[PDB]
């Protein structure tokens, strides 16, 4: 009755939680790696932004020179 | 460094290009350790877009980025730098870049940081607000309207929030000067209410200052959880204390406490004592009080001539002065040829004399717990390791370690104290200090050390509040700041370390350990109380209070995050069964004391988390309602109240604190939810009323009446049920007397009629009384019969005194019923 | 009592699971918002390249004008 239900809950629950805790940890690690990838994406983005601003400024300098 | 700076400055007096940019990039390192005019002239040329355009690739945006770092370095040097920067036009020069086109978001985000360092001094914010021509405030207001990225609208908001704080201090000064000097009519409640309203903004703009008034790193994004950014930050408090000093805050609080009208006002005394309490909890804040030491004494007198805040402030200031003297002694006199030097003996004697009264040991152990003030005593012992200076230092360190509860000084100094205690094996004052720092043996304070501390507590749990088991007070103080965050502040970013800390706590069996700690502490103060050790010394009381507070804080931190939004259920009925007994033992006397009250608040908070985690959909099934997290907690609390004859008055306080206040969308949501769960425990709630009705105690009776009023004000069915119970008590009381003989009236009947009269005064109880006496319900004729009996008693009075109280009570009941 | 031990062990393990899953949720939400901010940065990059193209085109027209 109740005792058998409690024992089955104990056994199967502990087994399957122990099994899927590892996949939960894998998910955490995957999200950490994705966050790292986002970090270098951001860094590259501001690098391109600074370089492009340099290009525009030298273009405007050539503009002021020719006119 | 100065020689190098002179050579660089003279070499590039008129040189522009790559060498000039290199010099600009190199200067900020040199300035750390009339050249000021040339530096200012250089700074205003590095911020010019007309000079950046005329430079080659990669050299044009490195000139602009290096011109916003000379501003952040020249301004921090002093007022002589900020004055020159403002005279040169840095405020307008930093807005021609933010308004310019095609500027990247990483260079606009750097110009804000240069401006934040200019308006951080009172000479700067005066020019920012009052125009020199449009001011910088108006320009920033227009800049907000323009479309910007996520990090530029957040950086411009910090400058705006800092400007608000400067303009709440300016209106306080004008309001106070007009209130005191002019009028003391105009001193009305429509004017004082502004002062209390303004003084609650100063306390609000300084509590949230670290989060809404600092400039975040360039690589940080405004997310509610902090990811992808440098861990370090900046401290805004020095700037805030720089604004408070310039406005003469302390010279004005004394004015509000020394004027005929608002000194006697209890709402202004409380408002101004909350700013002062917050301001004195930090080393910078305590040093703020001693900078203008003359104005601090007058404030102490003003607060004192009017509970122990003035004495605590005096003790803290004296302790800080003595600590500064101790540090200064070992600087001018590097070597102490005379170990018993008169100056240091006097300093130690004064410090020792402070530590007699309990309010003095709570201020000696508080100043020594900030920064590295504990190093003076350790240095004093190490120099001399007997001399009399050694004994005083040993006593003072024992006091500091025993009393202080914020154990952060122990993360760095626990290595020196342990070896010093090992060195002297014959001193009775060091053999005890080494027992307090027993768990701190090769421990590094991070999350990885939590299992070790929990293991130590689990092992040495048998010895609590015994001479050998004094390391449990420290093993629970250390564990309570590693894993327990401070109370949240509006505008915060949720750091993710705190979730991992709670996961580690649950992994390392924190739940069972803390429950065992609470149970063991409970079964010392009640059953082993026969020794009657009722806080004979200040150690047994402070230690017990600290253990209780630390365990409660850990329990609350675990249970709040675990039972956050009803995602997971909780059925362990041990926490809401030992919090009642702890309340009975400790919080038995309001409580006040600033420590006995917080325990009650924490107990109520822990008990309340069982209600928030509720299912709003499964509110109909009997199984889902009689086996909910709400119902189990309520059953445990109600059963706990009715188990000890001594634990009735304290239990009624707990029940009153649990229930909502007596009588929009959220108000009805909780009130009707409360009545739905209360309906299940009908037999438990009915037992409270009947059991406590047959007793004679004024506080118990008043608490019972208050609880009845609250439960009636909850919702309608509960009020009707309570009225059924009470009128049934009336019915049985009047049926106890045989109708064959003359009717017998006792004092219990008088108390019951008084209870009916007290209940009938409330409209919520009035409607239930009317509904019950109307007799609409089937089987409701008995209540009509008892009302007829009361009417017949009214029609047939007597001469007995008890009959007189009965008649007056029934007449009052009828008078209330007629209304 | 078997119920007490059962609820205790299941509570420990399921509390670990619930806290882990929460940690995942407020990591994912922050990652999504950071992706949105990256999209904003990319929009800036594309517009800035567009003005590069416009200015370079007008460069070619003035160059052919100069001859």
Numbering used by the authors:
A (entry chain B), C (entry chain E): 171 to 237
B (entry chain A): 381 to 413, 426 to 524, 527 to 578, 617 to 738, 755 to 833, 844 to 1047, 1051 to 1124, 1137 to 1292
Question: What does the paper behind this entry write?
Answer:
We further purified the METTL3–METTL14–WTAP1–273–VIRMA381–1486 complex for gradient fixation and cryo-EM analysis. Unexpectedly, in the cryo-EM structure, only WTAP171–237 and VIRMA381–1292 (with the stoichiometric ratio 2:1) and an unassigned density close to WTAP were observed. The observed WTAP171–237–VIRMA381–1292 in the quaternary complex adopted a flag-and-pole-like architecture with dimensions of ~116 Å × 103 Å × 80 Å. Two WTAP171–237 molecules (designated WTAPA and WTAPB) formed an asymmetric homodimer (the “flag pole”) while VIRMA381–1292 that contains 17 armadillo-like (ARML) repeats (designated ARML 1–17) formed a twisted α-solenoid-like superhelix (the “flag”). Two long helices in between of ARML 4–5 and of ARML 7–8 mediate the turning of the VIRMA α-solenoid, possibly accounting for the formation of the twisted architecture. However, compared to the WTAPs alone, VIRMA-bound WTAPs bent around the observed N-termini (around WTAPA residue 188 and WTAPB residue 185) and displayed a more compact and dense conformation with distinct intramolecular interactions. Hydrogen bond interactions were also observed between WTAP Q201A side chain and K198B main chain and between N205A main chain and Q201B side chain. These together contributed to the formation of the compact VIRMA-bound WTAP dimer that harbors a contiguous negatively charged surface patch involved in the interaction with VIRMA. Three intermolecular interaction interfaces, designated Interfaces 1, 2, and 3, could be observed between the WTAP171–237 dimer and VIRMA381–1292 with buried areas of ~773.9 Å2, ~1155.6 Å2, and ~101 Å2, respectively. Interface 1 is located in between WTAPA (residues 205–224) and VIRMA (residues 452–660). Interfaces 2 and 3 are in between of WTAPB (residues 177–200, 214–221) and VIRMA (residues 657–1030, 494–497).
N6-methyladenosine (m6A) is the most abundant and prevalent internal modification in mRNA. In mammals, m6A exerts pivotal roles in posttranscriptional regulation and its dysregulation is implicated in various diseases including cancer. m6A is installed by a multicomponent methyltransferase complex (MTC, also known as the m6A writer complex). The mammalian MTC is composed of the core m6A methyltransferase METTL3–METTL14 complex (MTC core) and several regulatory proteins including WTAP, the adaptor responsible for METTL3–METTL14 localization and proper substrate recruitment, and VIRMA (KIAA1429), the specificity mediator that mediates preferential m6A modification at the 3′ untranslated regions (UTRs). WTAP and VIRMA are important subunits of the m6A writer complex.
